[PDB]
Structure 1
């Protein structure tokens, strides 16, 4: 048997058979560097 089978997505198919785009975001944290930080908020500057 061929390992690869075509999905054959069609709009007329049901919700369970409609195409769904899936992205897995793995936040790997190797024990030395840090390159992906969060864009956290910055407030106003008040003096005196």
Structure 2
């Protein structure tokens, strides 16, 4: 006698029922890093901000629709985002002949 279990799952993806992903990861701070906190993706630096969020708020925004702050799902702490340093470069020369 062999005990056998049969498994059948449907398709068409519209009644999102069970699933998964999971696959959590540790946290970093004060360094440029790509983040996927809950589905939003971006690049910047992480720090602490005194601004507070309402209990139902997920992630903040600002004028000109930029992702300002995100709340970490694991700990529910307000974190801030600031991109890596970027800017133009200029060269000063006194003349190649001189």
Which band: TM-score by shorter chain? 0.3 to 0.5
TM-score, with structure 1 as normaliser = 0.45
Q: TM-score, normalised by structure 2?
A: 0.26
Which structure: greater strand fraction?
2
More helix by share: 1
